[PDB]
Every structure is written in C-alpha cells, then in structure tokens.
Write a protein that binds this DNA or RNA. Sequence first.
RNA 1: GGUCAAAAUGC
RNA 2: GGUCAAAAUGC
RNA 3: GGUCAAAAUGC
Lengths: 185, 374, 53
Amino acid sequence: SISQQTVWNQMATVRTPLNFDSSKQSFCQFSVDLLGGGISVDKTGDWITLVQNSPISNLLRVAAWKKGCLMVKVVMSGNAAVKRSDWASLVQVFLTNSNSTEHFDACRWTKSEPHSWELIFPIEVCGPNNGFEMWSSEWANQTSWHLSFLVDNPKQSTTFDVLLGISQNFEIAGNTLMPAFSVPQ
Amino acid sequence: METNLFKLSLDDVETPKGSMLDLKISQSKIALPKNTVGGTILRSDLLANFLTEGNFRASVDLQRTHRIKGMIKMVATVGIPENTGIALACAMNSSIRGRASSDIYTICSQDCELWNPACTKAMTMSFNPNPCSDAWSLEFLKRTGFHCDIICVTGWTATPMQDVQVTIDWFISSQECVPRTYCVLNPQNPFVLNRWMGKLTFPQGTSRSVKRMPLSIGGGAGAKSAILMNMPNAVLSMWRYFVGDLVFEVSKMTSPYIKCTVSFFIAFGNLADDTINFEAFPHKLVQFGEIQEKVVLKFSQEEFLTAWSTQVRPATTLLADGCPYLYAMVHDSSVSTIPGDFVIGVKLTIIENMCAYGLNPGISGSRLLGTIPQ
Amino acid sequence: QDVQVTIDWFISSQECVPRTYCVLNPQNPFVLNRWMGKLTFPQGTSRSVKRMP
RNA sequence: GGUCAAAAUGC
RNA sequence: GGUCAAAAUGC
RNA sequence: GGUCAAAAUGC
C-alpha cells in the first residue's frame, strides 16, 4: 500500500481550567468530536483548547463522506508535583455518536493511573450511502463518533492529548467546504 | 364493468428518461453586473435551490421521484465580444459547514469549470453528486448541503456597456452516475487532485515577469493566519514524499486582445530571474489562439530524478527548497492595444503514475498562492 | 470616410429555369419570401420578447 | 425549390 | 363500432 | 480518469 510504522498524527490537546473551585464540585467535563473536529467544554473555567492542523485532522474536517477504520490515542500527562501517595483522580471516558443524554454509550473506559496513562482503541465509520457516513447529517438521521471525558480532581489529571491514525482502508469522497483553519503564532 | 387499481401502473420507481427537453429540471439566471471585480461571489446557495427554479417538464419528476440514477447537466450561456473577458466558474462541492471560503482553491476539488465567455460562449458540465454511488435524490441534495458556487476569478478586461446575465439551463442526463472514491493510503491512477496552483499575472511590457510555483503541495493554500483546504490535498498531505507525472491546465482569463507567449519549464528556486540560459532546459512555449482558452500541459515523470517532499516549512528560503518548482516566463512580451494585464490560471488536474513513499506527521500551515484584481 | 460597393455584372454559364405560380394549386415547396420582421434587441438583460403573427 | 457556398493550394 | 372489462397472484 | 468537445449541413 502506502505505509509507515509508528507515524500517528496529532488532533487534540485539551487542558484543564486552572481556575477551578473545588466547590461547585469535584469534576470537570469535556468532549472531542473525532469525525467532526470540535472540542466542546465546561463552564467550570477558562479552558485551554487546541486542535491541531494536522494532515488528518485537516482531512477529516474537509472530507464529506467517510468509510473505514481510524485509530485513536488519548494520553494523560498530569501534575507531577503531586506525590503519588496523594493521588485522587480518575477520569471516566465515553464513546458516543451524539451529545445527547438519550443516546447510549458504545464503549466506556475508566482510568486512574497516577500522573500518566495511555489508551489505544479502534473506531470504525459505517454508514448508509454505500457504507459511507457524513457528519451529523439529517439524511439518515446520521451521526459521528464522540469521545467525551470526565475528570475528577482536574487539578491533578491536568492535561489530555488526543492522537489518531489511519487505517489502510479509510475511504472518503466529497468535499465538505470549510472555512479557513486558524494557525497559531 | 370494474377497474382494478392494483394492476394499474401507478407504482413505477424508474429514472426519468427522455429528450434533453423532457429531462429539463430548472433555469437559473445569474447576474454579471458590469462593475464586477473578481473574487466576487455571484451566487452561492444550495444546488437543490438552484434546481427548484422553474416548472420545466421533469421538474416535478425531480421532486416526486426518490431515486435518480442519472446526472445533473448544466448548460451556461453568455456571450461577450472579443475585446474583453471575464473568468467565471461553477463549483459544486458536497456540503458546507458554516461561514466557508469561496476562493477557488477551496471550491474546485470535486467538480468545477472555469470559462472565459469571450472564447467559450456555451459551457456544459455534468456531475454525480453522490461521489459514493450511482443515484441521487432532491431530498439528498437538500438535507446534505450540496452546494453550488458561481464566482468570478478574474474580472472584466473591458467594462461592458450595461449589465450582463448568465443563464444556466439545468437538466437530468441520459448518462449514468459513476463513483469516485478515494482510498487515502492506496491511491488510484490517475489520482485526481484538481488544485488551484495559482493565478499568474503578467503585466504589459518586456518583463520576463517570472512566476515560480512550489511543487510541494500539502496543507494547501495560505491565508493570513490560516490554511485553506480541499480533500484532494488533504489526502496528498497524508503521505510524505511524492512523484508522478504532473498534468497542468493553463486557462486564459483576459481578453483575447492581450497577447503573450508564456514559457513553462521545471527547475529549482536557486536561480536568478536574469538566467539567460533556462530555455536550454526542457521547456514548452504556450500561445493562445484568439478564441482558444485552454492549453493542457504535461510534464513527465522523467523531469524529476527523485521523489520530493510533500511539505516544506513556509519560510524555507527560495535558496533552501530541495523540491522542484514550476516556472512560468514571458518569452516575448505582453502586448495589447487596450489596458490589461495578461492573466492565466493554472490547475493541477491529475498526478498520473504516482509513487508515494511515506506518511507525513505534518508541518504547520503553508504558503501563499497568487490572486489579485480583475 | 465614405465607402463604395462595386457590383460586377455578368452572363452566366447556367440556363434559365421558370418559376411560375398557379394560385389555386400551389406547388411544393411553395416560395413565399416574406419579410417577417426586423427584430431589434437593446443591450442589457431584457427578455426583449418579440412576437410575430 | 432557385441562389449561394463546397468538394481546397504548389510546377 | 369506441370505451371498458378480461386473458389472474407468489420471489 | 470524469466532464467536455468531436465524428458536420440540405428535403
């Protein structure tokens, strides 16, 4: 085919509010629309989000019809000044196709590893065209893939990095006509 | 004495067949105000809104028929004399997600065609809106976002006496819809890219008015503080290194009265603009016939030794590109008897007999691409 | 400046063939040659629709 | 239908 | 004579 | 590669 080993590419980098009042609760909440390219956040604070203008990130935002398997990676880089006997943080991860409460969860992981953790898993896009799917289109009351998170003691489990990779069998077709992507500095 | 309703032919699920007349779905009239400047959105809407614009023979057939296994045919028409020229385009993309861009980079990847009415007095494009299969629906066109953008890329050369109107005739065709899908990791051949590679403008006079175009083509188009993007580029950039034969399409967008012989070749960026000696390089000299507006240019894979990088940082100094460039020059002069600037647009239609060694982690943003008035 | 049309007149190599009209038993194809109109369309975007009886 | 044009040039 | 009905269904 | 153009007119 066309292949290279261990070459994944960046999508997400979500950082947690610094201003967080351990009083109006313990958790912080956020979501990543893997097939849409959008980070949705809390009102808990002033969140620092960034989506990376990656070959793929770039591609999934523009390509209107998607069939195949993409590979995801979420990494927790945390607050390392916190002494390991003093860790109080879990982070509940969810995989859904809507941001609706009435929809049900596809997969559900819960990780509580001090200072850092890794999570590698497959997502597959199956749709009504010929097996092709379009981002949350009204056509077959179409959907996406969403990766939502729930952080407990967000002052500890501070940073989140989302990477994905592509499958030899990802096929697109069409152009979702999108505005200009913003490039830092 | 009774009639059976059941054995009546009221349940026919078939694609409309007929004469070009019978299979007429709409008539859009588009307005070309004589003070048009170029980069102007003449009309940007939804296809379904373009097609629902008149009650013409298969019009209800468009609306009350669930599966149409035929193709949307456009026939455009506006005549402009030979001492002026406008450069219009019809860009059909598959969805719009927000306040989107209407450049030409961003709107020419799927199915779009540029035409100078002074030279081409009647264009006909045909497309298949479900690049994934063989049938479409109006409700599809409706609830999915099929877009049609009609833009001016290089404004009037001579300003006409009063306003103008382009009338587009819309129809359903006699020919089947054929998919065009993209495997991103196992490209096809010939790979369809369709990339605005630039709007080359050559002022009137004896200036070699040398235009260099990067052959690195991932990220896409540059914007002030942003990157512009179209799938056929999105994917290319998924790879790391590339080769193949690059097939370019040079279009005249100025008035058949503005003359120039343009010289195209392939080199590197280290050369000075006063390099007497280039034309001792494989080169091809282009000249346009009065009413001729399209020259197709093919550079063979034998004009490149080794595959090149798909991305190069935006600052990389014309002295540090190790990647091949596409140089355009004036071999004579730009001459006219009316104010005007010679403008020709270049679009990389297909990379044929491609080789992609790699996978690109990415490089932030990309560089700029030419544009300007008229 | 002014212009001049020069018409060259000659006798031809080809025979003369009649064209008579029976008024009550027309021929085919019937030759009529009728100025049906001088249609003038002003510059602009006017359907400037011309109907001829 | 007539007319006309056309079925092309050089030694 | 026209019209109409009829010479029948399922995968 | 698609599109397009083209393989031409008259009774």
